[PDB]
């Protein structure tokens, strides 16, 4: 299938070369899969989710996304125009407040929440959890991400935006999950992207067009933006049967565009998520 | 710290 004049990153993911504008993907588009967007919530009623999104747990007073980061993330994961997987099921776990912050215990609880909740949802092709969030090194956060991962959910996590070694960096440094760095339109590592040996792959993260609150759209940048492209790609690939939750990260790395990024430090992988679509 |  093809989406003409798609946002650049959608085009990037289904291209071996930068500069293209069509996003080519398989029409299954993530249906059957579920992606838990652990964030600020999602504006489920946004027309772009076409009813495929829903809030499942909030740790706040409202289930509402009064931020947009979440809706933004949910959108690159699976809104109709801006998402990697146009037919995926989105579940919103508001572990983040309307300002984008929150506590490790609430983020860790959201994660245990999902590891349990997936058991009462119908996600025939797999469950992904996209975590466009992080903070400083925490063995408990790491740990929660590793339990989530081990409960059978593909954990995609932002590398972070400090232009530093993600080793610092939680859940980013939990070696069992998938640590997502960010890239720009020209194939360069995103100026803000974390790097290092715990990264597993890179996705488009520079000025990414997605859904916003209020029923609108907005382009923003970040490893938070690259994460969902890969959580979206994991969900797409899982619905395709190419991989499983447990080996989806490894499979995205093995099928990536290699050696294409520039500005990749020695020790960091030079791998770009690629859907490998063939018409 | 938080979203990322």
DSSP symbols for A211-224: EETTTEEEEE-SHH
- If one counts the domains in chain A, the total is 1
DSSP state of A168: S
Cα–Cα distance between A267 and A54 in angstroms, integer? 40
Give A110-114 contacts, CB < 8 A, sequence gap 24+. A110/A38, A110/A57, A110/A59, A111/A38, A111/A144, A111/A145, A111/A147, A111/A148, A112/A144, A112/A147, A112/A148, A113/A57, A114/A36, A114/A38, A114/A148, A114/A153
Q: Give the sign of the dihedral formed by CA A227, CA A232, CA A236, CA A238.
A: positive
**Known catalytic membership, residue A39:** yes
Instruction: Report residue A261 as tokens.
Output: 């990024």
Cα–Cα distance between A228 and A75 in angstroms, integer? 8
Cα–Cα distance between A221 and A260 in angstroms, integer? 20
Indicate the length of chain B as a whole number.
Answer: 4
User: Is the CB of A39 inside 8 Å of chain B's CB atoms?
Assistant: yes
Task: Tell me if residue A181 falls in helix, strand or coil.
Answer: strand
Beta strands A23-24 and A2-3: pairing type? antiparallel
The nearest CA of chain B is from the CA of A189 a distance in Å of: 16
Check whether the bond before B4 is cis (ω within 30° of 0).
yes
Q: Do the chains contact at A100 and B2, CB–CB below 8 Å?
A: yes
**Known catalytic membership, residue A229:** no
Cα–Cα distance between A277 and A259 in angstroms, integer? 19
Mutate to test the interface with B, among A41, A70, A76, A100 (most CBs of B within 10 A): A100
* Pick from A94, A85, A96: nearest CA to A123: A85
Cα–Cα distance between A188 and A182 in angstroms, integer? 9
* Pick from A45, A56, A192: nearest CA to A122: A56
Instruction: Report residue A128 as tokens.
Output: 């992904």
Task: Tell me if residue A101 falls in helix, strand or coil.
Answer: coil
Spell out the residues 6+ positions from residue A92 whose beta carbon is closer than 8 angstroms to its own.
A36, A37, A39, A41, A42, A44, A53, A54, A55, A56, A57, A63, A65, A70, A74
Indicate the length of chain A as a whole number.
Answer: 279
The span from the first CA to the last CA of chain A, in angstroms, equals: 8
Q: Do the chains contact at A96 and B3, CB–CB below 8 Å?
A: yes
Task: Tell me if residue A127 falls in helix, strand or coil.
Answer: strand
Q: Do the chains contact at B3 and A132, CB–CB below 8 Å?
A: yes
Which residues of chain A are within 8 Å of residue B2 when distances are taken between CB atoms?
Answer: 96, 100-102, 133-135
Instruction: Report residue A25 as tokens.
Output: 């993907």
Q: Which domain holds residue A118?
A: 1-279
Which residue of chain A is at minimal alpha-carbon distance from B3?
A133
Q: In this structure, are residues A268 and A199 in contact, taking their beta carbons and an 8 Å threshold?
A: yes
Q: Which residue has the tokens 């085009």?
A: A11
Residues 1-4 of B with CB under 8 A from A: 1-4
Cα–Cα distance between A55 and A37 in angstroms, integer? 9
* Pick from A212, A169, A160: nearest CA to A190: A160
The domain that holds A3 is classified in CATH as 3.40.50.200
Which residues of chain B are within 8 Å of residue A132 when distances are taken between CB atoms?
Answer: 3-4
């Amino acid at each position: 299938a093809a989406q003409t004049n798609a946002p650049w990153g959608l085009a990037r993911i289904s291209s071996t070369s930068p500069g293209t504008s069509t996003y080519y993907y398989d029409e299954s588009a993530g249906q059957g899969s579920c992606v838990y967007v652990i964030d600020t919530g999602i504006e489920a009623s946004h027309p772009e989710f076409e009813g495929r999104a829903q809030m499942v747990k909030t740790y706040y007073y409202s289930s509402r996304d009064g931020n947009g980061h979440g809706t933004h993330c949910a959108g690159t994961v699976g809104s109709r125009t801006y998402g990697v997987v146009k037919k995926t099921q989105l579940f919103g776990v508001k572990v983040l407040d309307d300002n984008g912050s929150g506590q490790y215990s609430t983020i860790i609880a959201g994660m245990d929440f999902v590891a349990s909740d997936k058991n009462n949802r119908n996600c025939p092709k797999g469950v992904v959890a996209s975590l466009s969030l992080g903070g400083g090194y925490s063995s408990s956060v790491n740990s929660a991400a590793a339990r989530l991962q081990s409960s059978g959910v593909m954990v995609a996590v932002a590398a972070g935006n400090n232009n530093a070694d993600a080793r610092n960096y939680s859940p980013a440094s939990e070696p069992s999950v998938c640590t997502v760095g960010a890239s720009d339109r020209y194939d360069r590592r995103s100026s803000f992207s974390n790097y290092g040996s715990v990264l597993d792959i890179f996705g488009p993260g520079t000025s990414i067009l997605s859904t916003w609150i209020g029923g609108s759209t907005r382009s923003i940048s970040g490893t938070s933006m690259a994460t969902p492209h890969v959580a979206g790609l994991a969900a797409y690939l899982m619905t395709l049967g190419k991989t499983t939750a447990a080996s989806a990260c490894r499979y995205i790395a093995d099928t990536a565009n290699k050696g294409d990024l520039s500005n990749i430090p020695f020790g960091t992988v030079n791998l770009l998520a690629y859907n490998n679509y063939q018409a | 710290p938080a979203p990322f």
